[PDB]
């Protein structure tokens, strides 16, 4: 995250780290949506143009973390992947359309002060919250600009009008994506960056004061560039696929 700030302890207890086994390194962000299911970006796992195609046993899930590099003894939990599920219509060839994936854990993780799942929105929450100008929150252990942080970073960002999103890029934008970030005129800035991939965009509903994951960090051209915006996978738009997977392979 660019131009964000240090997270508070327990501020994003749904925050998950995708960690490669060898060499040991941060892979992506991700989020806890139940004791056994983690949500992330498909591009974190599969991206043939960069010869990226991770299998279950190449990966670990690190939950409850604050520190980027430390092994947080008695706080974090580290879990084994049982099975990865990528959207069958994830478009890695063109624009990262349907950039979403699920990961089933080998055994359930124990909830704690630092470990707790986020909600997925229903149509009315999405309809009420995903409005231009409303702000969401994004978090991650990614780069601080186009160094790496010592701890989890956080930044609040406004959702941007779809035509403004469209007019910011040559890439073909879809209804499964939304963009967020400040316009050059709105003096403040901030953005997700490489390494934040797969992490959640969350909003706190003023109706029940629960946090909902509305988006997943997907793509952007550069990080925190004026007149460019970060693009997010539209979680509510892919929710039927999410339920199906969870319902079927439990």
């Amino acid at each position: 995250i660019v131009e964000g700030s240090d997270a508070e302890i327990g501020m994003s207890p749904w925050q998950v780290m995708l960690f490669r086994k060898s060499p040991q390194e941060l892979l992506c962000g991700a989020s806890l949506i139940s004791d056994r299911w983690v949500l992330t970006a498909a591009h974190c796992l599969l991206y043939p143009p960069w010869d990226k195609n991770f299998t279950e046993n190449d990966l670990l899930v690190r939950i409850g973390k604050h520190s980027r590099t430390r092994y947080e003894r008695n706080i974090e939990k580290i879990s084994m992947l049982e099975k990865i599920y990528i959207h069958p219509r994830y478009n890695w060839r063109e624009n990262l359309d349907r950039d979403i994936a699920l990961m089933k854990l080998k055994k359930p993780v124990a909830f704690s002060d630092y470990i707790h799942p986020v909600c997925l929105p229903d149509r009315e929450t999405a309809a009420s919250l995903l409005q231009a100008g409303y702000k969401g929150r994004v978090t991650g252990w990614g780069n601080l600009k186009e160094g790496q942080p010592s701890v989890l970073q956080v930044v609040n960002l406004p959702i941007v009008e779809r035509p403004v999103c469209k007019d910011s890029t040559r890439i073909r934008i879809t209804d499964n994506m939304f963009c967020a970030g400040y316009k050059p005129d709105e003096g403040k800035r901030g953005d997700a960056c490489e390494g934040d991939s797969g992490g959640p965009f969350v909003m706190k509903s003023p109706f029940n004061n629960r946090w909902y994951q509305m988006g997943i960090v997907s793509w952007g051209e550069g990080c925190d560039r004026d007149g460019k915006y970060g693009f997010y996978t539209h979680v509510f738009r892919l929710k039927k696929w999410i339920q199906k997977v969870i319902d079927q392979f439990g």
């Binding site: 960690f19 060499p23 040991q24 390194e25 670990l60 590099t69 092994y71 580290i78 790496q148």
Partner: peptide, 11 residues
């Protein structure tokens, strides 16, 4: 890398 070692058990 700059990452502290995780318990062998997870690997």
């Amino acid at each position: 890398g700059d990452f502290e070692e995780i318990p062998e058990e997870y690997l």
